[PDB]
Design a protein around this ligand. Structure first.
Ligand SMILES: Cc1nc(/N=N/c2ccc(S(=O)(=O)O)cc2S(=O)(=O)O)c(COP(=O)(O)O)c(C=O)c1O
Ligand SMILES: Cc1nc(/N=N/c2ccc(S(=O)(=O)O)cc2S(=O)(=O)O)c(COP(=O)(O)O)c(C=O)c1O
Ligand SMILES: Cc1nc(/N=N/c2ccc(S(=O)(=O)O)cc2S(=O)(=O)O)c(COP(=O)(O)O)c(C=O)c1O
Ligand SMILES: *[C@@H]1O[C@H](CO)[C@@H](O)[C@H](O)[C@H]1NC(C)=O
Ligand SMILES: *[C@@H]1O[C@H](CO)[C@@H](O)[C@H](O)[C@H]1NC(C)=O
Ligand SMILES: *[C@@H]1O[C@H](CO)[C@@H](O)[C@H](O)[C@H]1NC(C)=O
Ligand SMILES: *[C@@H]1O[C@H](CO)[C@@H](O)[C@H](O)[C@H]1NC(C)=O
Ligand SMILES: *[C@@H]1O[C@H](CO)[C@@H](O)[C@H](O)[C@H]1NC(C)=O
Ligand SMILES: *[C@@H]1O[C@H](CO)[C@@H](O)[C@H](O)[C@H]1NC(C)=O
Lengths: 320, 320, 320
């Protein structure tokens, strides 16, 4: 007779735990993101072998781009090349582009570590460096590593504000991330104020256990995930989010693979009645907002189905 | 003996309504958007205490940007600052940057309502207004409210074409939003033609009940939902969408929070061998295409499971 | 007594195949995309009835834009109009814009194939063709078909690298598309190596049976699906992706509809203290990364529910 109560207790435990009498609806969301703060750059680099001091300020129209869906990118490090005009000129001398005669590199080929098509004229580049000229935007941007001190090293002091509006299409529920009547001056913390939406780059990077400098030398991918477990029944009703953060990049730095996150941005202009462009190689962290969750509500068909299943189970148990 | 038929009737009702004999699969969709129409601007603004006239025309290359996934932005209002050179210059005098001596604002402190780093030497700015100069782009963008008449109030007179292509990966089904051989010169209405994809901005703004000449001042977020409910079984086969619109913005107008939807655009150029740039503070309505739906197909395993469940239920009912 | 074993065999088959004893969790993903390769353009065009030669080379900062979520765009063909000043000038003479008197077209009427607002002055434009001038950017970009040979016809030779990081928030599982210690230099193939993420545009276009040149005239929408079927149980544990491709565009080429994928890009500048802009109509294939999948783990409550259901089923079968 002990098993008769045991199966009843187990069914009650299952029903209380998994909420099998609850119909679950998916999430439909919309994310708004605002990045504040300004940065100050002051350092020196070696452009083409010549020392050059780069100093100035960056406001919220420089280190960012208009949001693409639910994500946002932040400038961290950049390599600048200016005064590029289209024409024939020798490339940066590497192992694969070096030559001693026109026989080595032939016209029409396209190496995967070079831009343009070479013509097969192995001429001296600089200080008796024989490379064959390529058709591209002169001067070709010499491939160099990112500076050891991060240019946008103050990016850990920036602030971000995230507004989330989730919907449940099965039911008549749409809710927001910010309840009306709460303070706006705050800083997120796992213990002090979980509900605080304002994050800080230093804090989110420290939570994952990675230092900002190493992750920012070449950039990476970061992810803020928001879990929405909401009970829409009349009793014990709550719809509140939980925030966590994870590194979305493999963090391997393989030579064959492509470490971090980077791209090239080209700005065009016309001067002296000829077109020209400036190229910035950009390494920065891209933050992805991953919002997910479920919404539960009371339904009778699923409850009846589960009741029938557990009735069959306990009847079979009572049979033997 | 009435219950012995009541249970069967309720089981049949549940099977017919909830479609428990139908395996369900989620949605994989794709959105293609094209916005047309032109806008004419003719108004007067007050910049730096001087009255200026802004007149001209914007076409589809102006008031929008290339689509970012399933979303599109429309320019509605802008504040322009032209001719910024980078250096030390006084900022806009607020209630926190004023001074009576250099000691009011320290050197190196980063204020949350100022772009640049003040140096700690506060001098007059205009009409004997003492502020401490910051190292930023000059002249500093004048903090002012958006003009009371919308510079692009004709934005409500626009048309947008949306093509949706959804898939059901579990089954073999990929369908579109528009069928072949139908008219393409129409206007969406809830009763006249639900299948019309061309959405007039005035129509979508009036369906929700919010006047266009109010949210256009600071922008906003709107969500267009294309709900799909397709029965992929051979019998009673139909797969058609239903369009709905909602306001995805809080619309609380909180001073502490950031109402509307605004961002800063920066355009760089070079004049007299000096790198300058132009700022445009942009307010506009960002439209989101929220697409969701579940595809249903007849399956034997779920039918058998539900049959067993109702067998248990009505057997228990017959027992007592 | 044969049915007694038959129902048990059917239940076992259903459990083994449909994996009803397995709890399924949805997918939370992130996509990183890198596009390599360079293009060379050398052709002749007819602008304003005059022959011109377009020659140059485009690198990875020209034929693309920064990634917008899980998608990326590639330039394929462009029509350029340089040096536009904003003022009153005649438009392109078409059927709906031609006139013989000022009364044919009235001021303030916005036709739906036009950029600008006419003032009602039917003046000569070229070869004694009378049209009423509109207020817009001049010269107005003449409407013409794209050149028959694609300008970026070499775009089919480009390579794209895709990195996928999928998550299962229900469980403790976050995995990646590329495993560590695997060769990077490779080309994707269904039989040779289906795990290589490096996709070739020519290869993917040929896989779907559509020639690259034909769809490159007006562009299109491409869809790459990554399907994940991962079993998280300790036994028979495997979680690897499968790659599929299809065309996301209707490919109807209806005159009323809008064939292909295209958009207008405007680049602003200042010359002689006058603001001018350059317009580029762009046709190109937009690639979408549709990633989806499910994660299966071992759970006891679903197993018990299905066990009870089959208990009722075979008990009813044995009853009659
Ligand atoms: C040292 C270094 N190396 C870079 N790339 N190295 C590649 C890239 C591709 C291939 S492969 O032929 O496809 O296998 C092989 C190599 S390898 O030299 O490491 O062997 C880049 C990125 O430059 P790009 O954006 O122009 O690609 C940067 C940027 O800063 C860099 O500092
Ligand atoms: C009146 C007005 N006010 C604005 N912002 N007001 C803020 C912003 C932040 C903070 S806080 O310190 O973070 O708490 C407090 C305030 S408060 O003055 O309302 O108290 C902006 C936006 O300007 P930004 O884009 O530069 O932020 C505009 C734009 O038009 C505006 O017209
Ligand atoms: C031949 C041709 N035709 C184009 N458009 N044709 C339209 C567009 C709209 C309407 S409708 O009034 O809305 O029904 C009717 C027509 S129709 O002439 O085919 O009947 C475009 C695109 O030009 P836009 O981007 O300026 O729209 C291009 C671009 O190359 C083109 O080559
Ligand atoms: C961030 O700001 C605080 C404010 O006092 C300052 O102490 C700290 O040095 C700053 N960190 C960086 C990296 O600039
Ligand atoms: C907000 O913070 C201030 C000081 O930081 C405090 O005085 C106030 O009680 C808080 N709550 C509200 C609702 O203002
Ligand atoms: C929109 O266009 C119609 C077309 O005639 C016109 O009557 C109406 O006044 C316009 N409204 C606005 C706000 O431009
Ligand atoms: C489309 O609309 C036109 C007039 O707007 C009408 O004459 C025609 O019958 C409609 N249907 C088709 C298939 O053209
Ligand atoms: C693609 O590159 C290969 C490399 O040899 C070349 O043979 C082929 O002609 C190229 N195709 C196009 C369309 O440029
Ligand atoms: C990778 O490819 C190279 C040649 O393409 C081959 O020699 C090597 O064995 C492969 N595997 C590894 C792990 O390098």
């Amino acid at each position: 007779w002990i098993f008769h109560a045991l199966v009843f207790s187990y069914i009650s435990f299952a029903l209380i735990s998994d909420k099998r009498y609850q119909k679950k609806e998916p999430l439909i969301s919309s994310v708004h993101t605002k990045v504040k703060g300004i940065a100050e750059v002051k350092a020196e680099i070696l452009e083409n072998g010549m020392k050059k001091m780069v100093s100035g300020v960056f406001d919220t129209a420089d280190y960012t781009f208009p949001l693409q869906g639910n994500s946002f990118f932040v400038m961290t490090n950049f390599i600048k090349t200016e005064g590029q005009q289209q024409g024939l000129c020798p490339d940066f001398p590497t192992a694969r582009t070096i030559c001693s005669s026109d026989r080595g590199c032939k016209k029409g080929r396209m190496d995967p570590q070079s831009k343009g098509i070479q013509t097969g004229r192995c001429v001296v580049y600089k200080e008796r460096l024989k490379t064959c000229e390529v058709s591209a935007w002169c001067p070709i941007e010499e491939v160099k590593d990112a500076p050891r001190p991060a240019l946008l090293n103050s990016a850990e002091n920036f602030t971000v504000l995230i507004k989330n509006n989730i919907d449940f299409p099965g039911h008549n529920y749409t809710t927001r991330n910010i309840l009306p009547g709460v303070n706006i001056t705050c800083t997120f913390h796992k213990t002090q104020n979980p509900q605080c939406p304002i994050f800080r780059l230093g804090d989110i990077f420290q939570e994952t256990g990675d230092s900002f400098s190493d992750v920012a030398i070449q950039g990476g991918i970061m992810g803020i995930e928001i879990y929405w477990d909401c009970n829409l029944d009349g009793w014990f009703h709550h719809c509140r989010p939980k925030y966590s953060f994870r590194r979305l990049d493999d963090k391997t730095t393989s030579e064959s693979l492509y470490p971090g996150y980077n791209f090239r941005y080209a700005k065009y202009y016309k001067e002296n009645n000829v077109e020209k462009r400036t190229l910035i190689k950009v390494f920065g962290i891209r933050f992805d907002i991953l919002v997910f969750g479920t919404g539960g509500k009371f339904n009778v068909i699923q409850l009846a189905v589960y009741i029938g299943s557990v009735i069959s189970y306990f009847g079979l148990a009572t049979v033997f």
